[PDB]
Structure formats: structure tokens, C-alpha cells
Amino acid sequence: SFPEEVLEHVFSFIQLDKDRNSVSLVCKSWYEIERWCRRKVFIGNCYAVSPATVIRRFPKVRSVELKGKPHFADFNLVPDGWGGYVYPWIEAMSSSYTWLEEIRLKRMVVTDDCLELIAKSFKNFKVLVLSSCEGFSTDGLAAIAATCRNLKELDLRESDVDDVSGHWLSHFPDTYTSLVSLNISCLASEVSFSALERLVTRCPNLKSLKLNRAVPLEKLATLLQRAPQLEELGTGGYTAEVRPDVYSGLSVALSGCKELRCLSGFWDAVPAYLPAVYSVCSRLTTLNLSYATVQSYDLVKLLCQCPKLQRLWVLDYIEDAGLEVLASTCKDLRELRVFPSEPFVMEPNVALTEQGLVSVSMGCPKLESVLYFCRQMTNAALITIARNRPNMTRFRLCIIEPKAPDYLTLEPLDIGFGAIVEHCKDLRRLSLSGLLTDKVFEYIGTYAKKMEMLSVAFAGDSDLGMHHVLSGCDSLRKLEIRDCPFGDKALLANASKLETMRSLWMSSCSVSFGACKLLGQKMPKLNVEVIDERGAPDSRPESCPVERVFIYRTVAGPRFDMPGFVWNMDQ
Amino acid sequence: LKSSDGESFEVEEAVALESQTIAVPLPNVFELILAANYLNIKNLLDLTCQTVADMIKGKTPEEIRTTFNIKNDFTPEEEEEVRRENQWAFE
Ligand SMILES: O=P(O)(O)O[C@H]1[C@H](OP(=O)(O)O)[C@@H](OP(=O)(O)O)[C@H](OP(=O)(O)O)[C@@H](OP(=O)(O)O)[C@H]1OP(=O)(O)O
Ligand SMILES: O=C(O)Cc1c[nH]c2ccccc12
């Protein structure tokens, strides 16, 4: 109800994607003012929309975030070459968003050409996050280091980089001082240590430093003395000859970092050097001990010192006894992830069971996010967890043996997971495992009204199970399924449901090529992609199950970069 | 300082230089917002504008326009096309 100047100013105070979208739809006038002052754009599926559409709607963007391959790519189920190329995005933006500051990519293919184009088009470029990306080398890293004079973040989390050489880092010039966050943890190639040390020294705003394994433990203290303002540290290698002078240099350097809240790295960690980390312990909010294969009592010694801990990622070496300690000591714990050591061994190498998760659920009243890998489970334990933690928002349970029943009753785990979705009303994410019938899905459809993301493997009896989910799950945005006896019937019965979701993934299920064709006919605003490496789906009977089908809504239509093993079903 | 209704106001230089406009007849003094803006008083403008933004945050289009007395000038098709792009592409 105000001059255009005032509304624009009102909007500066609205930065959430959803609120921005609501304002754009109050009237044509607000639509117009908001397009023009929108700073950030989040594109959760890069094939849901074209670069040209984004660039013309939102001409003044300074921050973009893009995601490519679906999650099951992490499990090696999307073959190489499938797609997720960011180049076209960067080419379109290169001439349009001259002022762009941030690019955050997740599971995209990013090449050295991409990186060079970024470096050269965006003078004010400050933030590059490459999360689980692939396609580039240290040469492309070299171009960013040499050219991006304003760079504040270079974050490479879990990317596959072509490790040509560690020389790229020494391309940051001596005039460069603006670095705030560096995560080189995925790099195998050794960086020039003195180049690194000189970079840390000349960068006073550096707050997060996550090293690669090739920085040895004995060099860590030297870097820390140069960056006492650090809030996050990921160590390099954590192994050395056990020596007083080495241990004490490390101890002093770390206790000189008074702002440190987050610790990670710990590769090859030797128990003798873990204590250097103790002065920091009392203020730590995140600990990632995932690469540390030290044993339960050693983890317990550390964790006793960590009353403020909010996030723990640990190996199952923690064991139930360790988790019982965690539950006592860490009352502010929000997130627990427990990863398998030895997942390709069926008999337990560690004493980590349901009881560890039970203890934590009882003792940690703010615990709301779980990823837990174990070998056995009971419906009784799941029911206790759900009752204790009605506040759970993300619950991810992976029992190592597919289709393992309750180990005491031999019943499916339908009832235990039923209890989770029944008692945890704000549960937004679930993944399942153990023996499960169609009944679990019926519980899910009935109770999981807030669930946004569901991952399923080796579960269910028939299409009625998938039908319950599509029919009942009001907030569903992502459904990913492998190896379940789910076919044509639920998929076609619930076709318009699919236009309310980001995507549906099914691999090794029983969805026929005929069903895929039909769904593509019926739903032209869907890209229905058959991903199958046996050759043309035409060369087999229509009734034959496809290897994989990936389905997603889009306003851009069929994509232009499908490889030879991918077919779109649109007419 | 003289207001638009002929009234007269006694303030000091300190208080009066907070207006970049003033910095005296003010023939133009939601009404507060118009006032911050016209007088170019930066904090008051921020403060009023953040308050209005709070009236928006978390509301759907219909309610936003309910509260500010705005009428829908999108044809049904237009509103369909924008909501879809908003949701499919940008959320
Ligand atoms: O909101 P989405 O687009 O559905 O993204 C989610 C969300 O990550 P964001 O922080 O990008 O919102 C999950 O995060 P949480 O809500 O659990 O904090 C994250 O899970 P992780 O915590 O394990 O990072 C998950 O990533 P993933 O599916 O790899 O586990 C990712 O979903 P995407 O797969 O679509 O990016
Ligand atoms: O969520 C995870 O990463 C683990 C998990 C547990 N059950 C699953 C089923 C399918 C895919 C992943 C999982």
C-alpha cells in the first residue's frame, strides 16, 4: 500500500524462499517489486526449470543454489553420464548476473571449464560450495585461486576431484587475504605446506579450516598458531610418533583457539594424541569422529569433556556402553549419526545394538535427528524411542542385513516404525529397514502427515504399500525406493500426486516399460526417465521391468542432455 | 518545523538533523511509514519497514492482501502459472 521504494525496503527484511513466493502472488505489483529485489534463488532440481526462465524472472540475483542428481546417486545407483551438468547454468549466468557472489552446487557435474568461466565472469565472486560434485580437477581449482580476488569460501565437501597436483593452492596471490572458510578435506593431493601456512597467516577473517589427510599431525600446531580465531577445524592426518614435545605443542596451540566450536578429521587417529583436544572440549558443539577408528573407552574419555555437544558423528566403535555415557553427559545433543565400521561383515565386530539408540532417546531430551547403522532391532526398542522422543524430526535406521526381523520375536518391524510415525508428529524424514510388510506403509500413510522425505529398500509386499504412501502422505516431496515389489498399479493410480512432489525414484522394482510410457502420455508436465543400460526398452516386451525410473515435475519440459541409456517418455 | 496542517514544532538541531530531508515547512506530514520515507529518517524507516515485513512473514497471498486491503489482479490462469513456477522451480 506504499510507494515502490518502501515496498522494496519492506522486502529486504524477507529472505525466506517461501515468504518471497507468497509476496510475489499478492498482486501483479508485488510480483514485479519482488522479482527485482530477490537476492537468492534455490533450485532443488536443476531440470525442474531452465536457466533462461530463472534469469529473466529474477534479474538481480547474487546467490544461486543448484542440486542435480538424486540422493540414490550416493549409493551408486545413477550411472555415470546421467546428467547434472552445471555448465549451461554458468554460461547463461555469465552474461546476465555480472554481480553474482555465491554458487552452491550439490551433486552436479562441474568441469574445469565451468570453474574458469566462473573465475572470469564474476568479479565479486565470494562463495563456492561444491558438495558431492565431480568432473573437475585441481587445475580448475588453480583458476579460482589465481583469479577470484574477493573469494571468501572455497568449500569442497565430499567431491570427487581429479587430483592432478597440490600446486593449485599456491596460485592464491600474496595480495589475497579475504578467505573465511576453506574445506579441502576431499583432496588426496598434498598442498604446498608453506603456501598453506602463508595463506592462513595473511587471512585474519579465516574462521573454518578443514584440511586434507596429507597435512600431517606434527604440522597442525604451526597452522593453529597462525589462526587463533578459528571456529571450526578439520585436522589433517592424526598420527605421529608418540612424543611429549609433539603432544604439548598441539595442546597449547588448540587451547590458544578460544573460539573453536567444531572439530573433525582425525584420520588414522592415535589414542595417545586425542587428549590435546581436551581444552577445546568444553565449548565444542560439533564433533565428527567418523574417520577415527579408536575404540569405545577412548571415545568415552573425550565425550565426557563435551557438555555443550549438539552434534555427534561417530563410528559404531562407540558401542552401547559409550552411548550410555553420551546420554548422561550430553543433555544438549540434537543430532547423532553412528556409522558402521566393517559394514561388509554380517557378524558384529562391535557391541552396538538397539540399546545404544534407546539410551540416547531416554537421556537426551533435545535429540531430534538420528542416523543409526546397527545389525539388530526390535519393535520394543522402536516403540520406546518413539514414546521418549515425540520431538524427532529425522529418523534414519539402517539394519545391515536386508529384511532382518525383530530379533526377539521374529516379527516384521511394522509396529515399531508405526509407533515412530504415530508419536513423532513433526517427523519430516524417514528411512526404513528390516523386515517390513505393506502394513508399515499403511501406518506411514495414516500418520506421517509431515513427512517430506522417505527412503525405502527391500520392503513391502505389493503395490498397496506404495499406494498407502502416495495416497496418505500429505507433505511428501521426495520418495526413493529400491528393491521393493512395487510396480505399475500404485504409480498410475496416484499419477497426479507426482505433480506435488519434487521427485520419485524407483530402481530394481517391478515398474514395467509399458507403465512408464503410459504415465509419460498421461502426465506431460512430468519428465518420466527410464534409465536402463541394457539398450532400447523397445527391444524387450513392454511388460518387462525397467532397471530404474526417475520421475520429476518440471516447467522446462524434456531435458536436452540425456545420454544414450536414458529415455524420456513424453509424447 | 511546520506541519501540513499549519502547526508549528519546536525541536533542536540534533533531533532535526535525523531527517535527511530537513537537513522548515513539511507539507507532507502506514502514515508513519510515509513520514519516515518523506523525511528520510533511516532508522525509523528500517523500524517501520521491519514491522510491516513481520505482518507478511509466514502468511499466504490471500491473507497478506486481506490485511493490507489489496485485491487480486491476477487472472486465474496467471495465478496458476506463477504458483506452479514458484513451487516447482524456486522452492
Ligand atoms: O531441504 P532439501 O532440499 O530436502 O535438502 C535436504 C536437507 O538438506 P538441506 O540442508 O540442503 O535443506 C537435508 O538436511 P536436514 O533437513 O537433515 O538438516 C539433507 O540431509 P543431510 O542432513 O544428511 O545433509 C539432505 O541431503 P541428503 O538427501 O544427501 O541426505 C537434503 O536432501 P537433498 O538430497 O535433496 O539435497
Ligand atoms: O538414510 C540413510 O542414509 C540410510 C537408510 C536406511 N534405510 C534406507 C533405505 C534406502 C536408502 C537408504 C536407507
* Ligand 1 centre distance from Cα of residue A453 (Å): 9
**CATH code assigned at A264:** 3.80.10.10
| A517 backbone dihedrals φ, ψ, rounded to 5° | -60, -50
C-alpha–C-alpha distance, residues A65 and A131, integer Å? 11
Residues composing chain B: 91
Give CA–CA dist A164/A559, Å, rounded: 32
Nearest CA to ligand 1 atom 1: A44
A69 labelled ligand-binding: no
Determination method here? X-ray
List CB contacts (< 8 A) between B46 and chain A: 9
Task: In whole angstroms, give the CA distance from residue A23 to residue A74.
Answer: 36
**Which among A370, A374, A407 has a CA at the least distance from the CA of A388?**
A370
The cell 598441539 sits on which residue?
Answer: A250
Interhelix angle A217-226/A244-255, rounded to 10 degrees, is: 30
Residues A509, A463 share a domain: yes
Q: Where are the alpha helices (DSSP H) in A364-425?
A: 379-388, 414-423
Atom 32 of ligand 1: nearest residue by CA position: A71
The CB-side HSE value for B26 (13 A sphere, CA atoms) comes to 20
Q: Which residues of A touch B (CB under 8 A)?
A: 1-3, 5-6, 9-14, 16-19, 21-31, 41-44, 48-49, 53-54, 57, 553-555
Q: Which three cell numbers stand for residue A358?
A: 534407546
Is A107 marked within a binding site? Answer: yes
Place of cell 508485488: A30
Q: Is the dihedral of CA A255, A256, A259, A261 positive or negative?
A: negative
In sequence order, what are the residues at sequence separation of 6 or more whose Cβ sits closer than 8 angstroms to the Cβ of residue A336? A312, A314, A326, A360, A364, A367, A369, A370, A371, A372
Number of domains composing chain A: 2
Please indicate whether, in this complex, the C-beta atoms of B30 and A2 are within 8 angstroms of each other.
yes
HSE, CB side, 13 Å, CA atoms: give it for residue A228. Answer: 7
Distance CA A146, CA A148 (A): 6
Pairing mode of beta strands A63-67, A478-482: unpaired
Of B79, B81, B83, B90, which to mutate for an interface test with A (greatest number of A Cβ within 10 Å)? B90
CB within 8 A of A242, min separation 6: which ones? A270, A272, A273
Whether residues A17 and A49 share a domain: the answer is no
A395 is in an annotated binding site: yes
CA A465, chain centre distance (Å): 27
CA distance A301 to A325: 10
Same domain, A31 and A48: no
Element holding A209 (H helix, E strand): strand A208-210
CB-based contact, B77 to chain A, within 8 Å: no
Within 8 A by CB and 6+ apart from A331, the residues are: A307, A363, A364, A365, A366
Resolution of the determined structure in angstroms stands at 2.2
CA trace torsion A24, A27, A28, A33 (10° rounding): -50
Judged on CB neighbours under 10 Å (0-12, 13-18, 19+), A191 is: buried
Alpha-carbon distance of B75 to A425, in angstroms, equals 37
> A244 and A107: one domain?
yes
Please tell me the distance from the alpha carbon of residue A184 to that of residue A169, in angstroms, as a whole number: 10
Numbers of helices and strands, H then E, in chain A: 20, 23
Give residue A214's Cα distance to chain centre.
25
- Is residue A373 part of an annotated ligand binding site? no
Contacts (Cβ under 8 Å, ≥6 apart) of B86: A21, A24, A25
CA of A399, nearest ligand number: 2
Question: DSSP secondary structure string, A137-206?
Answer: EHHHHHHHHHH-TT--EEE-TT-EEE---GGGGGGS-TT-----EEE-TT--SPP-HHHHHHHHHH-TT-
User: What's the Cα-to-Cα distance from A117 to each of A86, A141, A169, A372, A398, rounded to whole Å?
Assistant: 11, 12, 19, 41, 41
Q: Do B85 and A555 touch (CB under 8 A)?
A: yes
C-alpha cell at A556: 522446462
Greatest distance between any 2 Cα atoms in chain A: 72
Helix, strand, or coil (residue A253): helix
Q: CB under 8 Å, gap of 24 or more: what pairs does A518-521 form?
A: A518/A492, A519/A491, A519/A492, A519/A495, A519/A551, A519/A569, A520/A568, A520/A569, A520/A570, A520/A571, A521/A569, A521/A571
- Kind and range of the H or E element at A65? strand A63-67
B36 to A14, B22, B43: CA distances (angstroms):
20, 12, 8
For residue A471 the three cell numbers come to 495416497
The whole-angstrom separation of Cα A85 and Cα A117 is 14
A251: cell is 595442546
Q: List chain B residues with CB under 8 Å of A17.
A: 90-91
In chain B, what residues touch A23 (CB-CB under 8 Å)?
A: 56, 61, 64
DSSP symbols for A75-99: GT-S-TTS--B-HHHHHHHHHH-TT
Of A27, A31, A49, nearest to B89 by CB-CB distance is A49
In angstroms, the CA B5 to CA A339 distance is 73
Q: Is B79 on the interface with A (CB under 8 A)?
A: yes
* Residue A337: strand, helix, or coil: strand
Number of A–B residue contacts, CB under 8 Å = 97
> Residue A21's domain spans which residues?
1-38
Distance separating alpha carbons of residues A280 and A278, to the nearest angstrom = 5
Interface test with A, best of B37, B44, B88 (most A CBs within 10 A): B88
Nearest listed ligand to the Cα of residue A393 = 1
Instruction: Report how far apart the first and last C-alpha atoms of chain B are (Å, whole number).
Output: 49
Q: CATH no. for residue A25?
A: 1.20.1280.50
Same domain, A19 and A104: no
- Closest Cα in chain B to A40: B90
Whether A67 and A29 share a structural domain: no
Whether residues A85 and A193 fall in one domain: yes
- Provide the phi-psi class of A467: left if phi over 0, else alpha when psi is between -120 and 50, else beta: alpha
| Contact (CB, 8 A) for A517 and A11 | no
Q: Phi-psi category of A506—alpha, beta or left, where left has phi over 0 and alpha has psi -120 to 50?
A: beta
Q: CA-CA distance, A206 to A200, in Å (whole number)?
A: 7
Binning chain B into helix, strand and coil, the percentages to the nearest 5 are 55, 5, 45
From the CA of A502, the nearest ligand is 1
Tell how far the Cα of A418 is from the centroid of ligand 2, in angstroms.
17
Give residues with Cβ within 8 angstroms of A504, minimum separation 6: A478, A479, A480, A481, A491, A498, A550, A551, A552
- Counted residue by residue, chain A has a size of 571
Q: By three-state DSSP, how is residue B87 classified?
A: helix
Assess whether A122 and A52 both reside in one domain.
yes
Residues A29 and A140 in one domain: no
Residues A455 and A406 in one domain: yes
User: Cα–Cα distances in Å, from A330 out to A97, A290, A389?
Assistant: 46, 18, 16
Distance of CA A413 to the CA centre of its chain: 27
Q: How many CB atoms lie within 10 A of CB A131?
A: 17
Q: Are the CB atoms for A413 and A387 separated by under 8 Å? A: no
What is the amino acid identity at position A260?
L
CA of A71 to the centre of ligand 1 (A): 9
Query: What would the DSSP string read from start to end of B35-81?
Result: HHHHTT-HHHHHHHHHHHHHHHTT--HHHHHHHTT----S-HHHHHH
- A9 CB burial (10 A radius; 0-12, 13-18, 19+): buried
Name every chain A residue with its beta carbon within 8 A of the beta carbon of B90. 17, 21, 41-43, 49
User: Quick one: which H or E segment has residue B86?
Assistant: helix B76-89
Instruction: Dig out the grid coordinates for B62 from the structure.
Output: 490471500
Tell how strand A526-531 and strand A566-568 pair up.
Answer: antiparallel
> In the beta sheet, which residues pair with residue B25?
B2
Please give, rounded to a whole number of angstroms, the shortest distance from the CA of B12 to a CA of chain A. 28
User: A23 vs chain B: nearest CA distance in angstroms?
Assistant: 6
Please check whether residues A57 and A12 belong to one and the same domain: no
Q: Which amino acid is at A199?
A: L
Rounded distance, CA A73 to CA A455, Å? 13
DSSP assignments along A518-556, one per residue: HHHHH-TTEEEEEE-SSS-GGGS-TTSBPSEEEEEE-SS
* A15, A163: one domain: no
Give the pairing type, strands A102-106 and A134-137. Answer: unpaired
Return d(Cα A473, Cα A80) in angstroms, integer: 32
Would you report the helix, strand and coil content of chain A in percent, each value rounded to 5? 35, 20, 45
